[PDB]
Amino acid sequence: PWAMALTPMEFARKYNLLRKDDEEMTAGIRRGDAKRVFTMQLGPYWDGFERCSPQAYALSAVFMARMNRDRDAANNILKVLDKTFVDGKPDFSVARPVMKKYQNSELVQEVVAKHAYVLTVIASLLEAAREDGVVPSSEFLWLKPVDRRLWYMLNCVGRQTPYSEVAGPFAHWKAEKEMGRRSLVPMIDEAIRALEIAVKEVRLTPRQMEELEP
Amino acid sequence: PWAMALTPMEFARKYNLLRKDDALLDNPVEEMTAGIRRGDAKRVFTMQLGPYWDGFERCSPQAYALSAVFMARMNRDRDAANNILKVLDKTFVDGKPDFSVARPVMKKYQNSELVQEVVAKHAYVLTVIASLLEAAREDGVVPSSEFLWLKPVDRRLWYMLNCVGRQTPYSEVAGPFAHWKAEKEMGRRSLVPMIDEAIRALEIAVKEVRLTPRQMEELE
């Protein structure tokens, strides 16, 4: 699917995070439940590119190539991935040579050092790749159906407020940047506060208030 | 993860176009291959042809906007073309269907002399737009890589447009591809469907695939 991104309210309904609250027609949030949801969104620890999903691997390679000023290695990857998205199975393997050549470059090593999760490493690769050129989402539209999470994560790079579906890794990525080090302990509280704020802006119907537990 | 184009054999199974080959049963020659139901295949290919062209206004929003993009490229307005593609790109990220951006360009180029020649010569929305895309590619490259988003919204249009420049179409657009060709070969638009080349090609394709003995027997 290409379903639209969930709003705060939809996300909160989708994961059972709404709770009665003892401001009319308002709900509260299940903090501990929301914490688990946002922790599940962080995804795996980075532990070598080799262990990333193919598409994370390939996109990493593209942004790595951008960081080391190799616009052509990058565009070659994006070109083949486009071509093969039409054919109906992408050839992520085209990324292996660029990876091999830049994974240990100085600039990439600095990024991998600072972030603990696949999603936060690749977010920072993309951010860094953007100091070369523009590298918009639209050059990798094909990602949305492969890795919905990754697509949303990469679409939040440059932005202020993430989609709820990636609020967890967005908040952690920001925390890692603020702390100056990688962090394996999830730092997702910010996603909780934002979910609370958003849910308290939306009025429910009496049916929806009545359907709610404490 | 992505929907892949039907292969010809899967196409033929899906629309139930296979049958026992009467020519190879009353004189064998290759050994384990099905036939095609010519009459059912004409129906199927004719149904892939889609609506008659009858003003851009009556086209699907996606065909409308892509037309406008290719129109602008034929009239060498790269900016107006790219603006549409950007806004369509940007807005597809958000997943809000985004096509009104094209109205200014369509209003501007629709009665241009180059659009008029294309529209004059083709009778179906799919064959107009295929020929707009082909004309648009005499200015620049214009790959299906700016309308990747089209694939999810209009799969038929997506395939038809991915066959402009190809010599062999996907089976799923074989009808309109054949028709587009026949219009180009006749030098005029044709409302009567001209899809016989799609049928020959499918027969040829299907005879390249051996069935197992079980698949042979189930054939009717």
Curated annotation (Swiss-Prot), chain A:
Role noted for this protein: Component of the Dot/Icm type IVB secretion system (T4BSS), which is used to inject bacterial effector proteins into eukaryotic host cells. Part of a subcomplex which recruits effector proteins and delivers them to the core transmembrane subcomplex. Forms the interacting surface for recruitment of acidic Glu-rich motif-containing effectors.
Membrane topology: Multi-pass membrane protein
Any one GO biological process: protein transport
Segment of the intact protein contained: 158 to 380 of 380
Record note on what altering L42R does: Abolishes intracellular growth in A.castellanii
Keyword Transmembrane applies: yes
Alphabetic keyword roster: Cell inner membrane, Cell membrane, Membrane, Protein transport, Transmembrane, Transmembrane helix, Transport, Virulence
Protein name: Type 4 apparatus protein DotM
Protein source organism: Legionella pneumophila subsp. pneumophila (strain Philadelphia 1 / ATCC 33152 / DSM 7513)
Quaternary context: The T4BSS is a complex nanomachine composed of several subcomplexes. This subunit is part of the Type IV Coupling Complex (T4CC), a subcomplex composed of the DotLMNYZ core and the IcmSW-LvgA adapter subunits, linked by the C-terminal tail of DotL. Six DotLMNYZ hetero-pentameric units may assemble into a hexameric nanomachine, forming an inner membrane channel for effectors to pass through. Interacts directly with DotL.
Location of this chain's protein in the cell: Cell inner membrane
Result, substituting Y45R: Abolishes intracellular growth in A.castellanii
Gene Ontology CC terms: plasma membrane
Disulfide bonds: none
Gene (UniProt): dotM
UniProt comment concerning the protein's domains: Exhibits patches of positively charged residues, which form binding sites for acidic Glu-rich peptides.
Curated annotation (Swiss-Prot), chain B:
Swiss-Prot/TrEMBL keywords: Cell inner membrane, Cell membrane, Membrane, Protein transport, Transmembrane, Transmembrane helix, Transport, Virulence
UniProt-listed GO biological process terms: protein transport
Effect caused by changing Y52R: Abolishes intracellular growth in A.castellanii
A GO cellular-component term linked to this record: plasma membrane
Membrane topology: Multi-pass membrane protein
Primary subcellular site in the record, as a coarse category: membrane
Subcellular location: Cell inner membrane
Comment field on protein domains: Exhibits patches of positively charged residues, which form binding sites for acidic Glu-rich peptides.
Reported function: Component of the Dot/Icm type IVB secretion system (T4BSS), which is used to inject bacterial effector proteins into eukaryotic host cells. Part of a subcomplex which recruits effector proteins and delivers them to the core transmembrane subcomplex. Forms the interacting surface for recruitment of acidic Glu-rich motif-containing effectors.
Subunit field text: The T4BSS is a complex nanomachine composed of several subcomplexes. This subunit is part of the Type IV Coupling Complex (T4CC), a subcomplex composed of the DotLMNYZ core and the IcmSW-LvgA adapter subunits, linked by the C-terminal tail of DotL. Six DotLMNYZ hetero-pentameric units may assemble into a hexameric nanomachine, forming an inner membrane channel for effectors to pass through. Interacts directly with DotL.
Protein name stated in the entry: Type 4 apparatus protein DotM
